[PDB]
Protein backbone atom coordinates (compact mmCIF):
# COMPACT_ATOMS: atom_id res chain seq x y z
CA UNK A 1 0.00 0.00 0.00
CA UNK A 2 1.53 3.26 1.20
CA UNK A 3 4.06 1.09 3.02
CA UNK A 4 7.24 2.81 1.87
CA UNK A 5 5.83 6.33 2.21
CA UNK A 6 4.54 5.70 5.73
CA UNK A 7 7.84 4.35 7.06
CA UNK A 8 9.78 7.02 5.14
CA UNK A 9 7.74 9.72 6.88
CA UNK A 10 7.85 8.13 10.33
CA UNK A 11 10.18 9.66 12.93
CA UNK A 12 11.80 6.24 13.22
CA UNK A 13 13.44 6.64 9.81
CA UNK A 14 13.47 10.44 9.86
CA UNK A 15 14.79 11.08 13.36
CA UNK A 16 15.60 7.99 15.44
CA UNK A 17 17.98 6.07 13.15
CA UNK A 18 20.26 9.02 12.26
CA UNK A 19 20.20 10.36 15.82
CA UNK A 20 21.26 6.98 17.18
CA UNK A 21 23.96 6.64 14.53
CA UNK A 22 25.39 9.97 15.66
CA UNK A 23 25.10 8.94 19.31
CA UNK A 24 27.29 5.97 18.43
CA UNK A 25 29.67 8.31 16.61
CA UNK A 26 30.08 10.19 19.90
CA UNK A 27 31.97 7.19 21.30
CA UNK A 28 32.48 4.68 18.48
CA UNK A 29 34.70 2.34 20.51
CA UNK A 30 32.34 2.01 23.48
CA UNK A 31 30.90 -1.46 22.91
CA UNK A 32 28.32 -1.68 25.70
CA UNK A 33 26.97 1.80 25.00
CA UNK A 34 26.57 1.04 21.29
CA UNK A 35 24.87 -2.26 22.11
CA UNK A 36 22.48 -0.48 24.48
CA UNK A 37 21.72 1.97 21.67
CA UNK A 38 21.16 -0.84 19.15
CA UNK A 39 18.84 -2.77 21.47
CA UNK A 40 16.95 0.44 22.15
CA UNK A 41 16.41 1.13 18.45
CA UNK A 42 15.32 -2.48 17.97
CA UNK A 43 12.74 -2.11 20.74
CA UNK A 44 11.49 1.20 19.31
CA UNK A 45 11.03 -0.67 16.03
CA UNK A 46 9.08 -3.38 17.84
CA UNK A 47 6.86 -0.69 19.36
CA UNK A 48 6.37 0.91 15.94
CA UNK A 49 5.40 -2.44 14.45
CA UNK A 50 2.94 -2.91 17.30
CA UNK A 51 1.44 0.55 16.79
CA UNK A 52 2.30 2.59 13.64
CA UNK A 53 2.79 6.29 14.32
CA UNK A 54 3.69 5.89 17.99
CA UNK A 55 7.26 7.07 17.41
CA UNK A 56 5.90 10.21 15.75
CA UNK A 57 3.79 10.82 18.85
CA UNK A 58 6.69 10.09 21.20
CA UNK A 59 8.89 12.60 19.40
CA UNK A 60 6.14 15.21 19.10
CA UNK A 61 5.19 15.08 22.79
CA UNK A 62 8.89 15.05 23.67
CA UNK A 63 9.55 18.33 21.86
CA UNK A 64 6.20 19.65 23.09
CA UNK A 65 7.69 19.43 26.58
CA UNK A 66 10.62 21.66 25.55
CA UNK A 67 8.65 23.73 23.03
Amino acid sequence: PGSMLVQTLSCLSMIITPAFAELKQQDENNASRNQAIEELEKSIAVAEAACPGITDKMVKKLIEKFQ
Binding site: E22, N30, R33, Q35, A36, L40, C51, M58, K65, Q67
Partner: protein
Protein backbone atom coordinates in the same frame (compact mmCIF):
# COMPACT_ATOMS: atom_id res chain seq x y z
CA UNK B 1 15.68 5.13 40.87
CA UNK B 2 16.17 5.91 37.21
CA UNK B 3 18.03 8.94 35.86
CA UNK B 4 16.36 12.34 36.22
CA UNK B 5 15.95 12.94 32.46
CA UNK B 6 14.17 9.58 32.21
CA UNK B 7 11.54 10.01 34.92
CA UNK B 8 11.12 13.78 34.57
CA UNK B 9 11.03 13.98 30.77
CA UNK B 10 10.40 10.57 29.21
CA UNK B 11 8.06 8.99 31.80
CA UNK B 12 5.22 11.51 31.27
CA UNK B 13 5.57 10.93 27.52
CA UNK B 14 5.24 7.17 28.05
CA UNK B 15 2.11 7.67 30.15
CA UNK B 16 0.47 9.69 27.38
CA UNK B 17 1.42 7.00 24.86
CA UNK B 18 -0.61 4.42 26.81
CA UNK B 19 -3.93 5.69 25.44
CA UNK B 20 -2.56 5.03 21.96
CA UNK B 21 -1.49 1.46 22.72
CA UNK B 22 -0.60 0.13 26.17
CA UNK B 23 1.65 -2.69 24.94
CA UNK B 24 3.80 -0.51 22.66
CA UNK B 25 4.05 2.19 25.33
CA UNK B 26 5.20 -0.33 27.94
CA UNK B 27 7.71 -1.53 25.36
CA UNK B 28 9.09 2.01 24.95
CA UNK B 29 9.27 2.60 28.71
CA UNK B 30 10.96 -0.72 29.49
CA UNK B 31 13.41 -0.23 26.61
CA UNK B 32 14.46 3.24 27.78
CA UNK B 33 14.75 2.01 31.37
CA UNK B 34 17.05 -0.81 30.24
CA UNK B 35 19.16 1.41 27.98
CA UNK B 36 19.69 3.99 30.74
CA UNK B 37 20.32 1.21 33.25
CA UNK B 38 23.10 -0.14 31.04
CA UNK B 39 24.69 3.21 30.19
CA UNK B 40 23.80 6.17 32.47
CA UNK B 41 23.53 9.59 30.85
CA UNK B 42 22.25 8.01 27.64
CA UNK B 43 18.66 9.25 27.94
CA UNK B 44 19.94 12.83 28.13
CA UNK B 45 22.05 12.29 25.01
CA UNK B 46 19.04 10.83 23.20
CA UNK B 47 16.76 13.70 24.17
CA UNK B 48 19.31 16.37 23.27
CA UNK B 49 20.13 14.69 19.95
CA UNK B 50 16.43 14.44 19.09
CA UNK B 51 15.92 18.10 20.01
CA UNK B 52 18.89 18.88 17.78
CA UNK B 53 17.48 16.89 14.87
CA UNK B 54 14.21 18.81 15.16
CA UNK B 55 16.07 22.12 15.50
CA UNK B 56 14.54 22.97 18.86
CA UNK B 57 16.93 25.52 20.33
CA UNK B 58 16.77 25.67 24.11
CA UNK B 59 19.20 24.65 26.84
CA UNK B 60 18.48 21.11 27.98
CA UNK B 61 19.26 21.43 31.70
CA UNK B 62 17.41 24.75 32.00
CA UNK B 63 14.24 23.28 30.49
CA UNK B 64 14.71 20.16 32.61
CA UNK B 65 14.76 22.42 35.64
CA UNK B 66 11.66 24.25 34.41
CA UNK B 67 9.66 21.03 34.08
CA UNK B 68 11.09 19.25 37.14
CA UNK B 69 8.63 20.35 39.84
CA UNK B 70 5.87 17.84 39.10
CA UNK B 71 5.23 14.74 41.21
CA UNK B 72 6.67 11.43 40.12
CA UNK B 73 3.81 9.13 41.15
CA UNK B 74 5.76 5.88 41.47
CA UNK B 75 7.99 7.60 44.04
CA UNK B 76 5.38 9.57 46.02
CA UNK B 77 4.12 9.07 49.58
CA UNK B 78 0.39 8.80 50.25
CA UNK B 79 0.28 8.05 54.00
CA UNK B 80 -2.17 9.29 56.71
CA UNK B 81 0.54 10.18 59.26
CA UNK B 82 1.24 13.92 59.78
CA UNK B 83 5.00 13.47 59.33
CA UNK B 84 4.69 12.09 55.80
CA UNK B 85 2.03 14.58 54.69
CA UNK B 86 4.41 17.26 55.92
CA UNK B 87 7.22 15.53 54.02
CA UNK B 88 5.23 15.65 50.80
CA UNK B 89 4.27 19.29 51.28
CA UNK B 90 7.81 20.48 52.06
CA UNK B 91 9.37 18.42 49.26
CA UNK B 92 6.76 19.74 46.82
CA UNK B 93 7.48 23.32 47.89
CA UNK B 94 11.25 22.92 47.52
CA UNK B 95 10.90 21.38 44.05
CA UNK B 96 8.56 24.17 42.90
CA UNK B 97 10.81 26.96 44.16
CA UNK B 98 13.86 25.35 42.57
CA UNK B 99 11.88 25.03 39.34
CA UNK B 100 11.23 28.78 39.37
CA UNK B 101 14.98 29.52 39.08
CA UNK B 102 15.27 29.98 35.28
CA UNK B 103 12.41 32.50 35.38
CA UNK B 104 13.95 34.56 38.17
CA UNK B 105 17.71 34.39 37.64
CA UNK B 106 17.88 37.12 34.98
CA UNK B 107 16.41 39.59 37.47
CA UNK B 108 18.88 40.01 40.32
CA UNK B 109 16.31 41.35 42.79
CA UNK B 110 13.94 38.45 42.16
CA UNK B 111 16.80 35.95 42.27
CA UNK B 112 18.07 37.37 45.56
CA UNK B 113 14.56 36.75 46.90
CA UNK B 114 14.55 33.24 45.41
CA UNK B 115 17.71 32.34 47.32
CA UNK B 116 16.07 33.26 50.62
CA UNK B 117 12.98 31.28 49.63
CA UNK B 118 15.15 28.25 48.83
CA UNK B 119 17.02 28.49 52.13
CA UNK B 120 13.68 28.62 53.93
CA UNK B 121 12.29 25.64 52.00
CA UNK B 122 15.41 23.56 52.69
CA UNK B 123 15.26 24.44 56.39
CA UNK B 124 11.62 23.35 56.55
CA UNK B 125 12.22 20.15 54.56
CA UNK B 126 15.04 19.23 56.95
CA UNK B 127 12.79 20.00 59.92
CA UNK B 128 10.22 17.64 58.47
CA UNK B 129 12.74 14.84 57.89
CA UNK B 130 13.84 15.21 61.51
CA UNK B 131 10.21 14.95 62.58
CA UNK B 132 9.93 11.72 60.60
CA UNK B 133 12.99 10.20 62.26
CA UNK B 134 11.34 10.38 65.69
CA UNK B 135 17.67 6.92 56.54
CA UNK B 136 20.35 9.23 57.92
CA UNK B 137 22.37 8.40 54.82
CA UNK B 138 19.75 10.00 52.58
CA UNK B 139 19.46 12.95 54.95
CA UNK B 140 23.23 13.37 54.75
CA UNK B 141 23.12 13.19 50.96
CA UNK B 142 20.41 15.84 50.91
CA UNK B 143 22.46 18.07 53.22
CA UNK B 144 25.50 17.54 51.00
CA UNK B 145 23.66 18.58 47.84
CA UNK B 146 22.06 21.54 49.63
CA UNK B 147 25.54 22.66 50.65
CA UNK B 148 26.68 21.99 47.09
CA UNK B 149 23.90 24.26 45.86
CA UNK B 150 25.04 26.96 48.30
CA UNK B 151 28.64 26.70 47.10
CA UNK B 152 27.40 26.76 43.51
CA UNK B 153 25.64 30.03 44.32
CA UNK B 154 28.89 31.36 45.76
CA UNK B 155 30.68 30.48 42.52
CA UNK B 156 27.86 31.92 40.40
CA UNK B 157 28.05 35.33 42.06
CA UNK B 158 31.71 35.32 41.02
CA UNK B 159 31.69 34.02 37.43
CA UNK B 160 28.07 34.71 36.49
CA UNK B 161 27.53 31.33 34.84
CA UNK B 162 23.88 30.40 35.46
CA UNK B 163 24.11 26.95 33.87
CA UNK B 164 25.91 25.64 36.97
CA UNK B 165 23.07 26.92 39.15
CA UNK B 166 20.64 25.08 36.89
CA UNK B 167 22.68 21.89 37.29
CA UNK B 168 22.90 22.14 41.08
CA UNK B 169 19.18 22.90 41.31
CA UNK B 170 18.40 19.81 39.23
CA UNK B 171 20.61 17.62 41.42
CA UNK B 172 18.94 18.97 44.56
CA UNK B 173 15.53 18.17 43.06
CA UNK B 174 16.73 14.65 42.29
CA UNK B 175 17.92 14.30 45.88
CA UNK B 176 14.53 15.49 47.12
CA UNK B 177 12.92 12.77 45.01
CA UNK B 178 15.40 10.30 46.51
CA UNK B 179 14.36 11.37 50.01
CA UNK B 180 10.76 10.81 48.94
CA UNK B 181 11.51 7.34 47.58
CA UNK B 182 13.67 6.24 50.52
CA UNK B 183 11.05 7.32 53.05
CA UNK B 184 8.59 5.37 50.90
Amino acid sequence: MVSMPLYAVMYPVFNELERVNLSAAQTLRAAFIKAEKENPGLTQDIIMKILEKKSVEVNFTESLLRMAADDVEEYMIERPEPEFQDLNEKARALKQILSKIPDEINDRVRFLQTIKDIASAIKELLDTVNNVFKLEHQKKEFVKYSKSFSDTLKTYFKDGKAINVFVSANRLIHQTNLILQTFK
